[PDB]
Write a protein that binds this ligand. Structure first.
Ligand code: 8QW
Ligand code: CL
Length: 252
């Protein structure tokens, strides 16, 4: 059992395991299920501490706004630890993408509508996630949900081109990454999943004369979204507001 704000939660099991953190499935007093995230601050430098405070502040704040942000029922913070008590998932996306070989199309689209609402609402509060990946979303009553904001602190397929020339972050960056996910969700893999040598996989992402391949398919709209989501020049890439009005999410 765990105590947050003098409330007892019988642990049912581990679900998540970071270096300094855990996620637990958990029964409350009335034996309703919840996920609780534990973070251990014992070893946490001052920025890492501010990053946590910020992510939490912003996750706290976007409760009102969107059911597509992971619900957060309560939290405690202390110099030693953090507990966050949250609605409990079925499974993350990275998980659910690996097993599924064949995806119903009215359900891929429902999930895409869900990703757009979520990322739309963080863009409206000046949050660019800057590292979107399926890990960052969670299925919850068949509804897809964002669980973090890329503020707090090993795949590389979802990385947008402009990211690689950091070496300035516009919400377009997120659109690329949502792209990369949607691509996997229709062509069973990410765009640069074939190019295993990483030094060159980076070179492919930035190269305009390199051509991402979009197999012709039944939903032409969906083919259009992916091409528009994966334009290298971010000012030519399609905005979240644009994507929300695209036939693909609009035509029934
Ligand atoms: C059976 O349940 C399952 C099973 C399987 S599995 C093993 O089948 O793949 C998989 C999943 C579930 N459920 C589940 N439910 C929930 C609810 C909430 C979250 C959740 C919410 C927010 C965060 N936030 C953060 O990690 C960020 C980085 C953060 C936030 C605050 C900080 F101070 C520091 C960092 C992270 C996780 C995760 N899960 N996961
Ligand atoms: Cl509660």
């Amino acid at each position: 059992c765990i105590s947050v704000k003098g409330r007892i939660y019988s642990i049912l099991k581990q679900i998540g395991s970071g270096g300094s953190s855990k996620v637990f499935q958990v029964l409350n007093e009335k034996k309703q299920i919840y996920a609780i995230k534990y973070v251990n601050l014992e070893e946490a430098d001052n920025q890492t501490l501010d990053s946590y405070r910020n992510e939490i502040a912003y996750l706290n704040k976007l409760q009102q706004h969107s059911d597509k942000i992971i619900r957060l029922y309560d939290y405690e913070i202390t110099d030693q630890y953090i507990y966050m008590v949250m609605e409990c998932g079925n499974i993350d996306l990275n998980s659910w993408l690996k097993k599924k070989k064949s995806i119903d199309p009215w359900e891929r689209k429902s999930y895409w509508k869900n990703m757009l609402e979520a990322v739309h609402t963080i863009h409206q509060h000046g949050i660019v996630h800057s590292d979107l990946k399926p890990a960052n979303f969670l299925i919850v009553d068949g509804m897809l949900k964002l669980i973090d904001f890329g503020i707090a602190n090993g795949t590389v397929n979802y990385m947008p081109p402009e990211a690689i020339k950091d070496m300035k972050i516009s919400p377009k960056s997120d659109v690329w990454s949502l792209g990369c996910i949607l691509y996997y969700m229709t062509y069973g893999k990410t765009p640069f999943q074939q190019i295993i040598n990483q030094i060159s996989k980076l070179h492919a992402i930035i190269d305009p004369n390199h051509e991402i391949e979009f197999p012709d398919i039944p939903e032409k709209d969906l083919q259009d979204v992916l091409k528009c989501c994966l334009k290298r020049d971010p000012k030519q890439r399609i905005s979240i507001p644009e994507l929300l009005a695209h036939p693909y999410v609009q035509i029934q």
